[PDB]
Design a protein around this nucleic acid. Sequence first.
RNA 1: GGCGCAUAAAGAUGAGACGCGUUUUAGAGCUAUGCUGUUUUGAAAAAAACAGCAUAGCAAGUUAAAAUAAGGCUAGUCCGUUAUCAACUUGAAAAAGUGGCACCGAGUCGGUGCUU
Lengths: 1364, 123
Amino acid sequence: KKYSIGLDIGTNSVGWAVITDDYKVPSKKFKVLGNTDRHSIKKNLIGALLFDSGETAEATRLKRTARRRYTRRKNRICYLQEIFSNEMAKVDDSFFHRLEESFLVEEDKKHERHPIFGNIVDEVAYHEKYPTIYHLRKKLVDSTDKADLRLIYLALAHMIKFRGHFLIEGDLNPDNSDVDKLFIQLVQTYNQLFEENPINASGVDAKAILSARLSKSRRLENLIAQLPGEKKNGLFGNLIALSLGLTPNFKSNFDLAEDAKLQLSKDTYDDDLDNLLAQIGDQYADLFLAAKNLSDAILLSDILRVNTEITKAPLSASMIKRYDEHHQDLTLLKALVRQQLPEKYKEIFFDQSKNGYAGYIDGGASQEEFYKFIKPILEKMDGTEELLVKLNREDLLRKQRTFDNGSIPHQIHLGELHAILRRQEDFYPFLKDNREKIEKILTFRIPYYVGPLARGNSRFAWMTRKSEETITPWNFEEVVDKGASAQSFIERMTNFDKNLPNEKVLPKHSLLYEYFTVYNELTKVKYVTEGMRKPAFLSGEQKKAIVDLLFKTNRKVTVKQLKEDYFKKIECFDSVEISGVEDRFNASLGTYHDLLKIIKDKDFLDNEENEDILEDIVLTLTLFEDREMIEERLKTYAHLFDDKVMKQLKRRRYTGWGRLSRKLINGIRDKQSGKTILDFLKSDGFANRNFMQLIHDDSLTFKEDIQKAQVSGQGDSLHEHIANLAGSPAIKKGILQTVKVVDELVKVMGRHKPENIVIEMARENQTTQKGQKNSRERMKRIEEGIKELGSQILKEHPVENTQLQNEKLYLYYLQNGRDMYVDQELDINRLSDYDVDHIVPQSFLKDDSIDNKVLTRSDKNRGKSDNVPSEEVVKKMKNYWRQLLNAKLITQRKFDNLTKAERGGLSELDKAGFIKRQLVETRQITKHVAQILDSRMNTKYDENDKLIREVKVITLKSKLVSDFRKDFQFYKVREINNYHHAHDAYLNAVVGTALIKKYPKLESEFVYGDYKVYDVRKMIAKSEQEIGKATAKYFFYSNIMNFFKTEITLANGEIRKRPLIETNGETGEIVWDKGRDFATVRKVLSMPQVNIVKKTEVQTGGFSKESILPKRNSDKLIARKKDWDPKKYGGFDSPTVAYSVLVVAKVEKGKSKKLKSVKELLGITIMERSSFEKNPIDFLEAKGYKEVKKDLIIKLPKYSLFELENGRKRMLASAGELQKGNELALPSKYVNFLYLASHYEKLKGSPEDNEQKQLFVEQHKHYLDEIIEQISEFSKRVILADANLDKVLSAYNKHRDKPIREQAENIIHLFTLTNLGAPAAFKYFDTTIDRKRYTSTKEVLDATLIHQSITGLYETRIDLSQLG
Amino acid sequence: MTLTRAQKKYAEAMHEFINMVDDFEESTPDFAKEVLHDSDYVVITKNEKYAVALCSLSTDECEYDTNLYLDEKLVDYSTVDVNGVTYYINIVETNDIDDLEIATDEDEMKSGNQEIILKSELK
RNA sequence: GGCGCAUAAAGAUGAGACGCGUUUUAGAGCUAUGCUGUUUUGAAAAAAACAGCAUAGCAAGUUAAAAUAAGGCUAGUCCGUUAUCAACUUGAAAAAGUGGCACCGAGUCGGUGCUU
């Protein structure tokens, strides 16, 4: 029996469905193992797999680099200790012992209690003499006599634990820390970028303004008062705002759509930065990095304030000034509270829980939480002056170890470290011998290229050594083979190309990559001179002239400079309209002008010979951060550069990688001309194409040349092949699970192979479903359109974005309160009867977009033509359409649709576009899933060199199943049950197999393979309908989805009815029996039994929650080490159980401790899983279970499905918490009713069938009572929430008279009582009803366990009541 | 530099907050990082703390007459002052099974009194 | 659906470093009263504190040490939260293997016949 398989791949769900010739899903009685008495289960071969998302690996990368940096810092401490240890054991015996056990309670601490100095008196005298350690450090720098050695160790160990960022390289010269130089560098960057409105910073004094003692905003406005003025909300003003620490809002500077706020000091800055950089172009990231390092320079000069007593400790003196002003303001504020507010003193200084001062010190409360707290009750009091100006400058009661010490460079710690080491070297000869040793412990950063210092056992390392001993920071130079380490770093940290693998990509600022992107923009610019009326693209010598003339002169060139310097200056044309570029050229030769202002030689860069030199230079700057391996990978290029540009060009940095590789741009060539991609984009002749066309051209060799390399990038194993894909690990989990499903499923069906695997996959979405992130850019389009045209509409009828989900209102605003058909005013009160109108109709392609839908009064103000309406319409409205297009309300696509009849009509290429935009699919990952499945399922070669492609793995889009779903009323409601994955898979199978039977002539467009090059020039008619049963054309009506219909409602009201029983043209076989196939499909979407499987995974992840919870007398806590009992030290809480195993053994029960037989569901945490699987009955004997039976242990992970009495299914979720394992099947009439009634206003169609469906809503009001009857008859069986069901029945009875739209949306909210998984709380009309949790786990162990397979067709039903 | 899934899902959650109420300065609590991991929800209430939502545990098929328990558990609340009102951004962990406590009769009113602006789940 | 400019966007993996954060201990908490606490002159209480615990009032309060997944063996200045994972039969492990089919229907799959 031939069959097919439909697949719906998602991030959290794989839907799989098996169909036959007659479109029924099969029905196959399945054997069931185990020991229950049901020996055969009938199951439908439709279902889905449900699995929680594949989490990406970067959380582990964060935790792993944190583990590494903690281990490196501990080893820096151990290096300093193994230095000091000899003469420390001369001075104090167990000092390092006492610092090692400083954490312990006095009983566990096997020495004296005081870490420093031993006994009681000397530790007290130490803390009185040095209240912080910055006093100690500011003493040891600023002294000449000797100091105690363990006290010097405390100083130096505090230096080399907490040592500050390495981010600036060299020393603290004023070129990277004096903020005059940083601010003038920002001004140089800004004038280098814009050059129109260039700001002039000649007379500003950025040091004494941006660094002086003031509040932050007052510090800001003085600076804009200095320069002649941009704004306090301009780009440079908001950029200084970013540089000071307070949040600017950049949506007004670049005029974006959404609100984008960038605070520098947040812990989520540099992701808000790059997803702002996605909207603005990446020519600004240098401006924002200049903002950031100016901010660190300002904030460094904000910590460091001691400059008069300049004696060698600019940090420690600053922090003891902050200690002393903290102390004097504490005494001031304590005396001032007890003066003026005798209440709210215990609530301020004894509080420890309410953001007061005792919450700011003893408790856990922030700085700015404390300032939000204490700004009212210091605004209130009487004499409070200079305790509010140092709150608006954030400096009253400020700590030392704050969050802002992430800007101290390591050279400051190095400077006062150097000072401690050479004040003490005279008294201790021990340190005169090791001072370079100490400073090398401090200033040693394992570089990027070296990586983890492993000795073979890592998975992550590429250290290759020039010796064999222990790598300490002393001998890092004479152990690490840095050339070979850098080479292995390059081959680890390059990136492979997507459409030409086994190849390294270019860097993102590669010079030929910028030539590539300038040509990829200039291939689509078309110019119309005065007197030809034919838009022609640029030729070869014209492109050569403009690239050699203006791109190599100015960085970004707009259309004004384009026409001014080329058509006005060279071509001597007064005005030539320019099509493809809106305002500025999006591509720019940023690397070219950067290198031109670096090495000061245009003639060197105009040579074609130096491109390997320049690309090696850009690759060196892209890969490496380090000064040494950039100066040594440029010592090869010191031959050409006169040693002052070399100290200038080594400063230059880049990041990121280009999308393409060099063997793909200037690499592979065409056999007919020998031209590369760059050579085509220079001189293509008359017809200039772009890069995506050059790789999607079956005429040219280039797609086949990509196919030459795509054979090589395929591992023999499945998992490495899927790892080779491009996408999230969630969607790759989905791809791997659907391949598991395909292999398991073809194992089901007689071990045969299918005839088709049909695939759709629309996932990895981060568009927020376009509910609220869209309406802002909708109003943006409206308002800048009214800005450009100049005719006011929202001076007459304004509507905010709360109502702009209505499509007819948006279409009212975009045509300026007029009609694009007849010069009319759209009546606003009577918009309810004004019908929704397409331009390219619903019989040419299914679309619901603004570029296809328009609004007008009548049905046929349009015309009578099935194309874009007649020439009388478009010539008369040609005045108004240009006026409305030049304001940008509507797309150039929709203008070209409304100017498609003036050029004759729909061409062959036009309908070819209309069938490409519904049938082929452009995202790469769907093509790669099809590649996986036809490479695994079609495997038999033959006597020739061709794979006999038996199983045609075929690709849908989503819109085909979407309009088969909406148009024929197979309505989808996600919130009812999880069957919609499987019903979407079934409709995938139906639409795919029906399109492959009715249209085998188009299998060269949406099945993976290399089929015929016979395009669609012959399968669409050049005129109207062809002859019967001998038509070489497929369908002249360019919509593909028509043959499912009966009526074909045109744009002229006609029902051009297609035959009832569809047949194929090429063979005369029936493809679609309209009388019973929709009966079959609507019966399949009413299956009550659909194989929903929750994938029982073992929880891999963290050991527990990681908030370290304080000293509590509970048992629930986890010890942080093996000798730190949480009853005295505290520790983590809530261990994650990896799998809840079962124990049937004997405990000592009762007062006589009888070995009573028990069956308990023990929980095995992740901390204890390895010790469990070492010897499980040994651990269960250790736990308190006796005579444990090793065969009688059954592993139950999370989502382990049970089944209890009366068909109650409950999936395990913890050691003692269950979930709802039952699905709620609902017949398709009820689901159609709930989708129509819950979309009772937003139908978005012509009002004829909307009146039809609205009458279908209003007549079947009995369905709401039937649905609540059904949910009650369900929840009295498999949910058993008695009180919750009675609450929702009473709340249903109270709101029975409410309208159908609100009542329908609240019954779709009401379905959360019966969904799969965890119980939830859900809002029915006002009764926000509390959930019920299923914590009874003693009802589980008497009930049937089911071991479902990966599709659920194979069950091994273990009964647990049969055990002891 | 690069941040965890738990404070990524919080990052679009507050991004769904900052646009639709008003425009305002002083945005961040943004949080302690280890507390964002071990908390299941980020609710945002209006002018008040998230008074903790509540549940019931059916115990050994003889569940008593309406004993309500606090399934959620507030761990950290922190306020943002949008021009007139005080929105309380507050990240909430659930309670486990063994350590549920009985809620009083006042708290049953509080969850019905609440105005949940946005409850966004995050593991 | 969100075809959003008919073109189609951008994808994962990975190396380094700082900053906090959290937890315990160390920063002798003092005075007053009340209770347990031992003597003197003891012939029982009566007071000379010595300590411990409560309630008020005062005293400061900023820092450091350690740990930052338990730990592991390969002992590295490495590794330990990503993918993987239904039972059952082999196999040390990887890995391989195991389950009959049409029809009438449907309330989470049932039934009949055929074949074993």
